[PDB]
Design a protein around this ligand. Structure first.
Ligand SMILES: Cc1cc2nc3c(=O)[nH]c(=O)nc-3n(C[C@H](O)[C@H](O)[C@H](O)COP(=O)(O)O)c2cc1C
Ligand SMILES: Cc1cc2nc3c(=O)[nH]c(=O)nc-3n(C[C@H](O)[C@H](O)[C@H](O)COP(=O)(O)O)c2cc1C
Ligand SMILES: NC(=O)c1cccnc1
Ligand SMILES: NC(=O)c1cccnc1
Ligand code: NA
Ligand code: NA
Ligand code: NA
Ligand code: NA
Ligand code: NA
Ligand code: NA
Ligand code: NA
Ligand code: NA
Lengths: 404, 404
């Protein structure tokens, strides 16, 4: 069903805001949204070039790219997700950032590392193991799958964790700059590698990177500090999902509560800001959503108020913000402090002109979950076409191709 | 009467375009429009700050400031026009350019020098004469006015012309950069100083700055070349009005036809572009308008086709573009080559959101000639208010005040 909405034109959503070194002209953001339309070698494709281009047309919009692998060890999906570790990746991404910039908009790349959830057969083909802070599995099924192919999850050694900072993320950051990205965003949410380090259910290390709240945060803060010296703190973001149970994170049922874990991290970030090394933004997932799953009010165990209390800089919030449309009471409350951005991910898939629709109160086109993760153009770039012109069968067969 | 118009949203008017180092997101421009709401010392005012701010809200719009004096000798209006020759001027303008930039828009300052039309009593109070390329007057009345106060027009000496390049315009350019302007625009139109140099009715010099087509253009090209080394060619524009008879320019009735004079100048500009020193844009007044006066098709003696044929860079055209509204056939033809901007001046006075109105086909508010040149806020910033709230008598008494 089309979502009826009232116009946000005269609201804070269309007041400018400085984020790092750049000024956005709308507070509506496209959050990182995995779609699997990259090329098989992980280079961004012709489809992605149009896709991000189509969403950049309100000048001064921030778009954040779908999770992008920092390195071969960072991968582990069967579908084709993009990567930012080779010159080829960077050159292809550059065509996309150029297009976004030509519309006066900005783009952040989300850097992901799968960790314990990497598909063990996929990793085997690279001669790699699934790796994590500790040797744990999301489920007994995951454990079975890995041991079946003789490719069990293993804990990174101390030196490998150092390598993550000085090699894997450093190179990804350098490539992201070659590719013209305005920001890099550390993916510390949804039970992927950095989240695995942060929380105790997934990190039982006995070196400097585990064994306490402070040690578990150490890798993340070392990345923030090191990358700040490489690209500048103004080009760095980080995403967290304190309440999510996606990919079997314990969350509030863990031995350390997310309020403790994440308040520690956010306060350390603010202390860096106080010293003139404030990162560009902290992106947080609202408790209405866990990964890609909606959460009932009854199941919600907390909220993100603590982030606003502790961190004085820009905050990006996302998670079913249209739940109280058409009036958007929650959205308006959340952006009232003038330093908060609001993201829409699912509705941006089916509404490439979402910023324009929200501005002028145009009904939203419903999204199509069936085509979120498929491998072709149908339900991807087709939302930018007039229905009468979409040749469905042709588009289902249109797989990603090289740019140009 | 409100002008009925069709939406330009899907037209070239909303395709991006690179102008110098910056990219505009609309081809609709606010051309330089004198309004006399500066402070008495010529520092920009609180009223001007809001006025330009109000017109910058479509992100990526180019605004061009009202003619701004390069120096004390450049002045000569009774009304209060702004200047860019002191630190105070620059600091005040900076608040205005900051505001425009915070909306993602850009601003060019038009640098004017009045010359033979400077009010002789005003110039007397500065201890200065009206000056020009040659000692000529716009009319017998102008001659009478000047001789009456014992302050006749005089020809600049050769050294004074050099001073214009190395001192007057150089300092204005440096201040414009201090003030954060994206471009400086040489005013070579409408019978002011640079136009007085270009055309033979106003320039009968016998030094290197007159006596031939090439010598008459020499000062203008020396300014282009010298300022290009100071601020970079990408930050320079120039405005010409080949067909105008404003302030008694002979135009087509002169001993050298404007097609000759202005084709010479534009071709010299293109030759600089060919060598990598191409200026940002050439602004031309369409033959529908002469200064502030509409011209009948019957009286029009030529057109600006030659500029498009000779110059390969960005062109800004202005002059009663709504004459064939609501369809805008002429506007669409003129921007079809993808390197042409179109300006609206009179309708931008009464429609601060003009870009938005044109985008979505909203009827235009009629402009009010009676308040074009008055000294107070009524009919100036009042167009941004809802009529029901305008206290007319209060606004008529609201004269310009210092910013902040
Ligand atoms: C298809 C899909 C792909 C997603 N991919 C990512 C991702 O790559 N990185 C990420 O941090 N979140 C991802 N998310 C979570 C979303 O960014 C977003 O936080 C969530 O969908 C809630 O926002 P919404 O209600 O506006 O969709 C994804 C969600 C969906 C539905
Ligand atoms: C009140 C007024 C002030 C103007 N001031 C300037 C100026 O300072 N410099 C300039 O080059 N042209 C000036 N012009 C000419 C306009 O920029 C424009 O070229 C002309 O008005 C035709 O455009 P329009 O039909 O959209 O008004 C002015 C015109 C008007 C009506
Ligand atoms: N990378 C992510 O955080 C992600 C991907 C797909 C669905 N939900 C979350
Ligand atoms: N400066 C100008 O070119 C100008 C000023 C007022 C009216 N018309 C033209
Ligand atoms: Na655009
Ligand atoms: Na999985
Ligand atoms: Na989580
Ligand atoms: Na808030
Ligand atoms: Na704005
Ligand atoms: Na006069
Ligand atoms: Na003229
Ligand atoms: Na043209």
């Amino acid at each position: 069903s089309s979502v009826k909405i009232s116009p946000l034109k005269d609201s804070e959503a269309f007041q400018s805001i400085k984020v790092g070194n750049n000024t956005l002209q709308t507070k509506i953001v496209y959050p990182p949204t995995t779609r699997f339309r990259a090329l098989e070698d992980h280079t961004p494709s012709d489809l992605q070039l149009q896709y991000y281009g189509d969403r950049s047309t309100f000048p001064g919009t921030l778009l954040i790219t779908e999770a992008t692998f920092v390195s071969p060890q960072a991968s582990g999906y069967e579908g084709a997700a993009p990567g930012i570790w080779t010159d080829k990746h960077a050159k292809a991404w550059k065509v996309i950032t150029d297009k976004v910039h030509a519309n006066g908009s900005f783009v952040s790349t989300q850097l992901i590392f799968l960790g314990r959830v990497a598909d063990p057969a996929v990793m085997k083909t690279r001669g790699l193991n699934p790796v994590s802070a500790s040797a744990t599995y999301e489920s007994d099924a995951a454990k079975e799958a890995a041991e079946a192919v003789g490719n069990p999850v293993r804990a990174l050694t101390t030196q490998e964790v150092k390598d993550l900072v000085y090699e894997a993320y450093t190179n990804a950051a350098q490539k992201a700059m070659d590719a013209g990205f305005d920001y890099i965003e550390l993916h510390a949410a949804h039970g992927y590698l950095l989240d695995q380090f942060l929380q105790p259910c997934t990190n039982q290390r006995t070196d400097e990177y585990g064994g306490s709240i402070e040690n578990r945060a150490r890798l993340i803060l070392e990345l923030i500090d090191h990358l700040s010296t490489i690209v500048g703190a103004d080009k760095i973001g980080i995403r967290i999902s304190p309440w999510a149970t996606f990919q079997n994170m314990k969350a509030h049922k863990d031995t350390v509560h997310p309020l403790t874990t994440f308040s520690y991290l956010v306060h350390e970030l603010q202390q860096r800001a106080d010293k003139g090394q404030g990162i560009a933004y902290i992106s947080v997932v609202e408790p209405r959503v866990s990964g890609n799953v909606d959460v009932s009010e009854e199941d919600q165990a907390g909220d993100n108020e603590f982030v606003s209390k502790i961190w004085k800089g820009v905050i990006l919030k996302a998670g079913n913000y249209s739940y109280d449309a058409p009036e958007f009471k929650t959205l308006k409350e959340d952006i009232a402090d003038k330093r908060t951005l609001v993201g829409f991910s699912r509705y941006f898939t089916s509404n490439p002109n979402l910023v324009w629709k929200l501005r002028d109160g145009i009904d939203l086109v419903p999204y199509d979950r069936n085509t979120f993760y498929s491998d072709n153009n149908y339900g991807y770039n087709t939302f930018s076409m007039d229905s009468e012109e979409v040749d469905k069968e042709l588009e289902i067969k249109r797989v990603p191709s090289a740019i140009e």
